Design an enzyme around this catalytic site. Structure first.
Site, PDB file in Angstrom:
ATOM      1  N   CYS A 199      -1.803   0.845   7.297  1.00 18.50           N
ATOM      2  CA  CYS A 199      -3.256   0.579   7.373  1.00 18.50           C
ATOM      3  C   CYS A 199      -3.612  -0.650   6.581  1.00 18.50           C
ATOM      4  O   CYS A 199      -3.784  -1.720   7.152  1.00 18.50           O
ATOM      5  CB  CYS A 199      -4.100   1.723   6.904  1.00 18.50           C
ATOM      6  SG  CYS A 199      -3.843   3.220   7.968  1.00 18.50           S
ATOM      7  N   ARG A 200      -3.677  -0.499   5.274  1.00 17.44           N
ATOM      8  CA  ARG A 200      -4.211  -1.573   4.396  1.00 17.44           C
ATOM      9  C   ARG A 200      -3.344  -2.843   4.214  1.00 17.44           C
ATOM     10  O   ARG A 200      -3.818  -3.960   4.420  1.00 17.44           O
ATOM     11  CB  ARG A 200      -4.538  -1.016   3.017  1.00 17.44           C
ATOM     12  CG  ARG A 200      -5.719  -0.013   2.976  1.00 17.44           C
ATOM     13  CD  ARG A 200      -5.801   0.748   1.700  1.00 17.44           C
ATOM     14  NE  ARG A 200      -4.647   1.693   1.623  1.00 17.44           N
ATOM     15  CZ  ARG A 200      -4.382   2.411   0.559  1.00 17.44           C
ATOM     16  NH1 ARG A 200      -5.184   2.323  -0.507  1.00 17.44           N
ATOM     17  NH2 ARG A 200      -3.356   3.258   0.540  1.00 17.44           N
ATOM     18  N   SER A 201      -2.084  -2.684   3.819  1.00 19.89           N
ATOM     19  CA  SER A 201      -1.292  -3.857   3.538  1.00 19.89           C
ATOM     20  C   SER A 201      -0.927  -4.611   4.828  1.00 19.89           C
ATOM     21  O   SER A 201      -0.895  -5.802   4.775  1.00 19.89           O
ATOM     22  CB  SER A 201      -0.064  -3.599   2.649  1.00 19.89           C
ATOM     23  OG  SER A 201       0.868  -2.718   3.221  1.00 19.89           O
TER      24      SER A 201
ATOM     25  N   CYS B  74       0.841  -1.197   0.000  1.00 19.14           N
ATOM     26  CA  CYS B  74       0.000   0.000   0.000  1.00 19.14           C
ATOM     27  C   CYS B  74       0.879   1.250   0.000  1.00 19.14           C
ATOM     28  O   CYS B  74       2.123   1.186  -0.149  1.00 19.14           O
ATOM     29  CB  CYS B  74      -1.044  -0.057   1.168  1.00 19.14           C
ATOM     30  SG  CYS B  74      -0.351  -0.112   2.835  1.00 19.14           S
TER      31      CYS B  74
ATOM     32  N   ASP C 162      -7.852   3.996   0.723  1.00 18.42           N
ATOM     33  CA  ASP C 162      -7.097   4.449   1.895  1.00 18.42           C
ATOM     34  C   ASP C 162      -8.018   4.899   3.068  1.00 18.42           C
ATOM     35  O   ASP C 162      -8.765   5.914   2.911  1.00 18.42           O
ATOM     36  CB  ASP C 162      -6.230   5.616   1.414  1.00 18.42           C
ATOM     37  CG  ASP C 162      -5.343   6.174   2.470  1.00 18.42           C
ATOM     38  OD1 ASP C 162      -5.359   5.715   3.630  1.00 18.42           O
ATOM     39  OD2 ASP C 162      -4.536   7.096   2.146  1.00 18.42           O
TER      40      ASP C 162
ATOM     41  N   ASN D  92       2.162   1.437   4.248  1.00 18.71           N
ATOM     42  CA  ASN D  92       2.322   0.202   4.974  1.00 18.71           C
ATOM     43  C   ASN D  92       1.994   0.351   6.475  1.00 18.71           C
ATOM     44  O   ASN D  92       2.688  -0.226   7.267  1.00 18.71           O
ATOM     45  CB  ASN D  92       3.745  -0.369   4.717  1.00 18.71           C
ATOM     46  CG  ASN D  92       3.984  -1.784   5.239  1.00 18.71           C
ATOM     47  OD1 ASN D  92       5.117  -2.099   5.699  1.00 18.71           O
ATOM     48  ND2 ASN D  92       2.997  -2.692   5.106  1.00 18.71           N
TER      49      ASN D  92
END
Length: 157
Positions: free
Chosen positions: A17-19, A12, A129, A15
């Site tokens: 939140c999402r990934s 993401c 995001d 690195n």
């Protein structure tokens, strides 16, 4: 009757939140299926903004709500990642542009670079995001990651 060893890097922007959520979700899936030993799993960022940080506390809490823990610390994608991972699965259109650009700047690119959401049976192609959002945005990302990760596992060989 062994499955071959495979590797995936979730990417993401930050690195944080999402990934890290995608990585942890995928790790929990393969552990639930008793095939964790057949996967190498990591996450990483397009940017160098957050290097060394543990995931955003909202993300850690989201994961804890679903019985998942992570010990990840943020790192930036490197040239060597493109040579070592079988799959690089990213969150949004901007991540995809940035990774395709970086892959052009390296000599060895084994990795297939794809949107993680390209695996969603429910066709939600972009994992947006959540950083400026609230806990419900992190939950949406979690549920997207579960769907996409599950489908990816059943398609990837």
């Amino acid at each position: 009757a062994e499955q071959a060893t495979k590797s995936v890097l979730f990417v993401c922007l930050g690195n944080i939140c999402r990934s890290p959520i995608a990585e942890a979700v995928f790790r929990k899936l393969v552990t639930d299926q008793n095939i964790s030993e057949n996967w190498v799993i990591d996450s990483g960022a397009v940017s160098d903004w957050n290097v060394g940080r543990s995931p955003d506390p909202r993300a850690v809490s989201c994961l804890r709500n679903h019985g998942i823990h992570t010990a990840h610390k943020a790192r930036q994608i490197t040239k060597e990642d493109f040579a070592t991972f079988d799959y690089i699965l990213c969150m949004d259109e901007s991540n995809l542009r940035d990774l395709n650009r970086k892959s052009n700047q390296v000599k060895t690119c084994k990795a297939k670079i794809e949107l993680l959401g390209s695996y969603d049976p429910q066709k939600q192609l972009i994992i947006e995001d959540p950083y400026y959002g609230n806990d419900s945005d992190f939950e949406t990302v979690y549920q997207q990651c579960v769907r996409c990760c599950r489908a990816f596992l059943e398609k990837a060989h």
